[PDB]
Design a protein around this ligand. Structure first.
Ligand code: CDL
Ligand code: T7X
Ligand code: T7X
Ligand code: T7X
Ligand code: PSC
Ligand code: 3PE
Lengths: 64, 59, 469, 81, 89, 180, 167, 47
């Protein structure tokens, strides 16, 4: 599914925003808009990776 | 109801085993000069050095 | 597009003042990002392992080499972020982490010379690119010239690179003396049987390999890595390794070689037991590179080793990059800063790191357990896919020596952990200034890759299956 | 059994003997380049030794492979001890 | 091949057993490059082609650039230490 | 005037031994300049008259001038060739001389056999027959073909070489300036 | 005379699903055949470099508190942004000639143009001011140079006779 | 006791390790203090 891939990659973006907050000795929700910034960026990487795997499967089935 | 759902998973894993054995076959297979080297200029024949050239130099 | 950046950059840097250097690096940082994002669609060229040769059989472009140049650009974006962004706004970190005027020039010229090795088809392209990147490492080592250790290291690296470049030149012209040719495309599966190219091709591979730091000739490079400052050595440890090894893995000229197997066994032995009783963190950190280059000398013996290679390359690159960035971050918490170029030296100086920024120790623990090869992390699948190629191809003693070497190397990896999770008397409570948002996000990205990168293994194997087969 | 076997000789094959073996082998390979005041003469003679020695080894080694195993065992002995 | 082989070998061993100063190491490096040139240009003459001459004219330029780079490296070695030791760096 | 090549081989040996054993560092460098001249003699001797003057122009006139220019205004200590210092070296010098010499002579040969590989390097005695063919109509000498193939087939090598020359400009400047 | 290719060459060897147009298109044809989305990519990259420098200053300022970057940096950012955008648009448009992306918009233009060049009574790929040896070497240099856009920019400006096509 | 990955005795490096008896010691390039670049060892370096 595409939606589960997007939500999971956004969770990876939330994880990297959280961990970078906590390296800075900040609270968790220090700057809450960086969460949506990081989630949109990592979800875009998930979008790219999903589309490349999709085109790859189509190339593999065109060898029938 | 559970034997069929296990046969489905076994079919899906034997499909991956067949796919893996296939994709291992595909790499050890030899390949064309037009695919391995550049596609344009598909012949390995050099015909190189063309100014002071001798007739009879070809073979 | 590197050429554009160099041509633009030295023009622009000659006219800037020294107040502007850091901002220049920021510019180049963003430039390289938009070369990744806006230009990577060229992967569509390399369907079904379609390979091109460019400039008259001079350069070779396949998808392997496309992945290698993407990796080198990603790492250059990270390193140039480390120079172009302040750690803190103290009067301390300005006198410690300061770029020179011509640093990014030599960075991009070295990235150019490192790309023209992996993309190379003939031997004179190989030669000219090897010397381009070698002179660039000479000058990157010598650019912080107000330092006794870096000056001595640049002189040592000059002479030991000069010998091993003349050995490559001797092997190339020796190959030319028996075959009127420059290509290894000349070889084509039949010539190797009826011709003794063993001594030639193995001497070529050896002269290429002694620059990495393989085992009989490893100590000079460990001394260069300890003597250079802490920002220079994260670049000169990584880039010749991945460029020269990506050349020698793409060209399969030492398949089932007895000499490469001897030196791989010796490399795994001397790197594992060499860095055991060592108290400096860059020494400790460089014998890790010695062992992890041994694991590549193993794949040099292999035919069809492109999965295990590329996986373990980006594995080692992310783990390497992160473990140097963590000890950049630990400088704020040490009780003793010596040596302006190299402010943390001894590994006992990070002793109470769990009581000051415990999540830096979470970071550290993650990347160290991935160095060991613990299964939830990304280093395990690298070692696993190396083993799947070693055992498939009959290297049974090499396998057990690999396992014993990884077990011995786990000791001095865990020694970092053993030091950092310990009691300390005076712990931090309240600190006014913050670490860089831009630059701690990079360390967190590098961790999230290492921990949650096992998710995408099957996606990566399928995309592998289409573009390389 | 509790002293001479379990705490005695199963630790000599275990964590107490391996620590001493690795201590000695690491000390020897670190003092491999302790000698000379010079960095450069040390390392450039070290490059000569190996591109001589490897060539001598394969000269032995295509003649017969049995007569080169103890040579390599002895090289490991003088390298690690 | 004899002259290039022996200048390369004697040049190499003079480099290796140099304990007296540093510039003997530089000039032994340059004479090694000369011996490589000799071997290659003989092979180009014997094979009737320019391609060894091509690699030789390129390695002339690379030898020059390495001499320039490395001698500036020695000058920066000398900046902070107004002496160059006899035993080496 | 048959043994000319043998004479240059012998004189090159002798000149390298005078390079590595010399009182004064610049006595050693003048012996290197003499070795460049012996090289250019061999290159004219074999048939490459172009290259010999390229060696005299580039190696003698630029690299040796830079080298002598360095030795003049910098201080370099030197021990001389004591016998107490260097006969501790001599047994490995002798072993490595014979081994590296034979081993450099080894790789011109294709045998399974070790010393058939060696003595085919000495199977030299046969005099090549030079034939005239009238197939070439113009004065394409060797520098012309180097200029054709540096510029058409290996144009990319010439441009990467321009980047190398650029680096040889930027680097020595970048080291030795001390910007303000 | 000055158009016989005198070599053996791929014929309609398509690199993807879609049929090829050229094996290396001339620079004029690539600039002529690029889509408005390609000019949008050029404008995107020209905007993204100075906005990226302003953004990366807003994230972490250089000397501690935030200022705008100088105009001397913004103009070099805009120049390098046009460089990135032109490299991206040239590579995008060359992909349609190779037949790895959708090119039915441009395939019609090429059959129209080569029909026009047959009707005008001239050579199908252009009269060049080179000997056919130099045309052949010059097109061995620029063949498939769009791969390796990351290292060096290299283009085709020679009117050489062969482009991986028949008749 | 500071330990050194094999349970060995390793020196704790404070500011008291760069004197002029610690000057040009006999040692491996590992396990050695007296760095040559230190704000107490240069201390009017090019003056
Ligand atoms: C994008 C940038 C360039 C666009 C400029 C606009 C050109 C244009 O549209 O005119 C088309 C125009 C088309 O003519 P036309 O009449 O429309 O069409 C009929 C054919 O041309 C007729 O074909 P033909 O076969 O009859 O022609 C034979 C052909 C045979 O010769 C060639 O065509 C040359 C082949 C060489 C190809 C090299 C490719 C470019 C490489 C760039 C750098 C690579 C670095 C790699 C290093 C590693 O060309 C000629 O005979 C013409 C000779 C031209 C002489 C004038 C050259 C002026 C150079 C000034 C450039 C300044 C750049 C400074 C940058 C800083 O052709 C030319 O002008 C040829 C120009 C050759 C290239 C010049 C500029 C190259 C770019 C340099 C920098 C590139 C970007 C920066 C990268 C970083 C390093 C520099
Ligand atoms: C520095 C600056 C430059 C200095 C230059 C001066 C020196 C120049 C000489 C150049 C040498 C440079 C040094 C090179 C390093 C040493 C290189 C070297 O040992 O490779 C050996 C030489 O394979 C010979 O066939 C064995 C070769 C035997 C050589 C005999 C030597 C005789 C000396 C007598 C005294 C490579 O076998 P290898 O490992 O593939 O092993 C082979 C295996 O033996 C075969 O059974 C298999 O068919 C094959 O698959 C593979 O397994
Ligand atoms: C598929 C292959 C896998 C790829 C894995 C990707 C790895 C790196 C990807 C990076 C793409 C990055 C997306 C992140 C964008 C969102 C993001 O967190 O903003 C940055 C980090 O910004 C990078 O550090 C930007 C780093 C750019 C690096 C680009 C590398 C390409 C963190 O700002 P932040 O909130 O903590 O902090 C700021 C700032 O501290 C205050 O002065 C301001 O008051 C306010 O602006 C406050 O928000
Ligand atoms: C077959 C059976 C496999 C079973 C083998 C069990 C061997 C395991 C074993 O000895 O524990 C270890 C690991 O030592 C290796 O290097 C780990 C194992 C090295 C050898 C691996 C197995 C060799 C099999 C050869 C075939 C021996 O050092 P060790 O723990 O005292 O070392 C620790 C020490 O305990 C701590 O007190 C120190 O603070 C710490 O720094 C560190 O030095
Ligand atoms: C807009 C996007 C711009 C382009 C971004 C590119 C950045 C280059 C970064 C390199 C280091 C970071 C790791 C990224 C691994 C990417 C895997 C991959 O896809 O590589 C492929 C398989 O790799 C292989 O065999 C083996 C590769 C091993 C990977 C092992 C690490 C696994 C975990 C990290 C990667 C997954 C992270 C995904 C997070 C959402 C081989 O090459 P491709 O022609 O198919 O590339 C196409 C990628 N494109 C479409 C984004 C251009
Ligand atoms: C269309 C389909 C595709 C859609 C995908 C597109 C995604 C776009 C991104 C959506 C953005 C939604 C944001 C939701 C996440 C918000 C995270 C957050 O703000 O958590 C803050 C929380 C602490 O909150 P706070 O009250 O501020 O405590 C500190 C006070 N000193 O701290 C926490 O809760 C820690 C959370 C970190 C958890 C990381 C791992 C789990 C993920």
């Amino acid at each position: 599914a595409l939606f589960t891939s997007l939500v999971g990659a956004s969770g990876l973006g939330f994880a990297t925003k959280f961990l970078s907050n906590k390296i800075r000795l900040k609270p968790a929700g220090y700057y809450p808009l960086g969460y949506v910034f990081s989630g949109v960026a990592w979800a875009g990487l998930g979008l790219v990776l999903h589309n490349v795997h999709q085109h790859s499967l189509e190339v593999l089935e065109k060898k029938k | 109801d559970i034997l069929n759902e296990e046969a489905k998973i076994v079919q899906a894993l034997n499909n991956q085993r067949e796919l893996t054995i296939k994709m291992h076959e595909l790499k050890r297979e030899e390949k064309d000069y037009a695919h391995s080297y550049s596609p344009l200029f598909s012949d390995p024949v050099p015909q190189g050095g063309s100014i002071g050239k001798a007739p009879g130099s070809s073979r | 597009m590197l050429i554009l950046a160099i041509i633009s950059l030295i023009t622009f840097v000659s006219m800037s003042k020294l107040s502007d250097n850091r901002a220049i690096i920021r510019l180049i940082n963003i430039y390289l990002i938009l070369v990744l994002v806006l230009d990577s669609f060229l992967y569509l060229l390399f369907l079904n392992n379609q390979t091109y040769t460019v400039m008259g059989e001079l350069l070779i472009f396949n998808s392997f080499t496309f992945y290698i140049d993407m990796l080198i650009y990603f790492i250059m974006i990270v390193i140039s972020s480390l120079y172009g962004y302040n750690l803190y706004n103290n009067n301390l970190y300005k006198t410690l982490f300061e770029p020179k005027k011509e640093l990014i020039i030599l960075f991009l010229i070295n990235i150019l010379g490192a790309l023209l090795i992996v993309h190379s088809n003939d031997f004179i392209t190989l030669f000219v690119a090897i010397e381009l990147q070698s002179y660039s490492i000479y000058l990157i080592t010598a650019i912080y010239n107000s330092s006794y250790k870096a000056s001595k290291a640049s002189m040592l690296y000059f002479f030991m690179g000069g010998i091993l470049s003349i050995l490559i030149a001797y092997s190339i012209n020796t190959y030319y003396s028996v075959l009127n040719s420059y290509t290894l495309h000349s070889l084509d599966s039949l010539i190797i049987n009826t011709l003794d190219l063993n001594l030639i091709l193995i001497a070529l591979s050896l002269g290429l390999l002694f620059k990495i730091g393989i085992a009989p000739l490893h100590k000079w490079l460990i001394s260069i890595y300890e003597n250079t400052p802490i920002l220079i050595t994260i670049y000169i440890s990584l880039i010749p390794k991945i460029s020269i090894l990506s050349y020698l893995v793409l060209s399969n000229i030492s398949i089932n070689s007895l000499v490469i197997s001897i030196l791989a066994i010796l490399t795994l032995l001397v790197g594992s037991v060499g860095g055991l009783l060592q108290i400096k963190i860059k020494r400790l950190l460089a014998f890790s590179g010695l062992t992890n280059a041994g694991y590549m000398m193993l794949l040099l013996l292999l035919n069809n080793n492109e999965f295990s290679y590329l996986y373990y390359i980006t594995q080692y690159s992310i783990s390497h990059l992160a473990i140097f960035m963590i000890i950049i971050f630990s400088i704020y918490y040490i009780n003793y800063i010596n040596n302006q170029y190299n402010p943390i030296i001894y590994v006992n100086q990070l002793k109470g790191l769990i009581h000051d920024n415990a999540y830096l120790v979470l970071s550290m623990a993650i990347v160290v357990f991935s160095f060991i090869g613990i299964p939830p992390l990304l280093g395990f699948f690298g070692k696993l896919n190396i083993l799947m190629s070693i055992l498939n191809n009959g290297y049974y003693f090499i396998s057990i020596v690999l396992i014993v070497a990884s077990l011995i190397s786990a000791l001095y990896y865990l020694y970092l952990l053993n030091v950092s999770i310990q009691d300390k008397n005076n712990i931090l409570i309240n600190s006014n200034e913050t670490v860089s948002s831009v630059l701690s996000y990079i360390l967190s990205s590098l961790i999230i890759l290492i921990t949650f990168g096992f998710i995408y293994n099957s996606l990566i194997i399928d995309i592998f299956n289409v573009y390389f087969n | 059994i509790a002293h001479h076997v379990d705490k005695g000789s199963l630790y000599r094959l275990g964590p107490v003997g391996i620590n001493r073996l690795l201590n000695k082998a690491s000390y020897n390979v670190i003092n491999l380049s302790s000698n000379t005041r010079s960095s450069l003469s040390m390392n450039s003679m070290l490059i000569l030794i190996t591109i001589v020695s490897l060539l001598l080894l394969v000269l032995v080694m295509n003649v017969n492979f049995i007569i080169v195993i103890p040579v390599l065992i002895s090289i490991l002995y003088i390298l690690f001890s | 091949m004899f002259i290039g082989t022996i200048i390369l070998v004697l040049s190499f061993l003079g480099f290796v057993f140099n304990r007296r100063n540093i510039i003997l190491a530089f000039i032994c490096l340059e004479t090694m490059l000369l011996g490589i040139n000799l071997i290659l240009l003989r092979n180009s003459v014997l094979f009737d082609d320019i391609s060894g001459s091509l690699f030789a004219i390129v390695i002339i330029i690379l030898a020059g650039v390495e001499s320039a780079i490395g001698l500036s490296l020695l000058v920066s070695y000398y900046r902070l230490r107004g002496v160059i030791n006899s035993y080496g760096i | 005037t048959y043994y000319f090549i043998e004479i240059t081989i012998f004189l090159a040996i002798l000149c390298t031994i005078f390079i590595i054993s010399a009182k004064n560092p610049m006595v050693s460098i003048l012996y290197m300049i003499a070795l460049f001249v012996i090289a250019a003699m061999y290159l004219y001797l074999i048939g490459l008259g172009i290259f010999s003057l390229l060696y005299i122009m580039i190696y003698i006139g630029a690299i040796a001038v830079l080298f002598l220019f360095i030795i003049t205004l910098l201080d370099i200590n030197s021990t001389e060739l004591s016998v107490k210092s260097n006969i501790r070296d001599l047994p490995l010098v002798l072993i490595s001389l014979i081994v590296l010499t034979i081993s450099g002579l080894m790789i011109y040969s294709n045998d399974s056999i070790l010393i058939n590989k060696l003595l085919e390097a000495f199977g030299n005695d046969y005099n090549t027959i030079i034939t005239q063919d009238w197939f070439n109509i113009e004065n394409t000498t060797l520098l012309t073909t180097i200029g054709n193939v540096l510029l058409t087939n290996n144009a990319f090598i010439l441009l990467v070489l321009a980047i190398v020359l650029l680096l040889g400009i930027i680097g020595p400047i970048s080291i030795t300036m001390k910007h303000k | 005379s000055s158009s016989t290719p005198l070599v053996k060459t791929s014929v309609n060897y398509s690199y993807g699903d879609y049929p090829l147009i050229d094996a290396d298109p001339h620079f004029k044809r690539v600039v002529g055949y690029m889509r408005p989305s390609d000019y949008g990519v050029i404008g995107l990259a020209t905007a993204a470099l100075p906005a990226g420098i302003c953004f990366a200053e807003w994230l972490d300022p250089v000397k501690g508190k935030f200022a705008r970057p100088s105009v001397k940096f913004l103009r070099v950012a805009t120049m390098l942004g046009f460089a990135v955008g032109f490299g991206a648009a040239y590579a995008r448009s060359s992909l349609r000639f190779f037949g790895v992306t959708e090119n039915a918009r441009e395939y019609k233009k090429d059959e129209a143009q080569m029909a026009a060049r047959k009707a005008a009574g001239l050579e199908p790929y252009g009269t060049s001011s080179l000997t056919p040896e130099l045309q052949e070497i010059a097109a061995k240099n620029s063949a498939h140079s769009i791969a390796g856009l990351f290292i060096f920019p290299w283009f085709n400006f020679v009117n050489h006779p062969y482009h991986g096509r028949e008749q | 006791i500071p330990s050194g990955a094999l349970g060995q005795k390793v020196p704790h490096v404070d500011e008291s390790h760069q004197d002029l008896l610690f000057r040009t010691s006999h040692m491996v390039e590992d396990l050695e203090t007296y760095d040559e670049d230190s704000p107490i060892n240069t201390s009017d370096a090019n003056t």
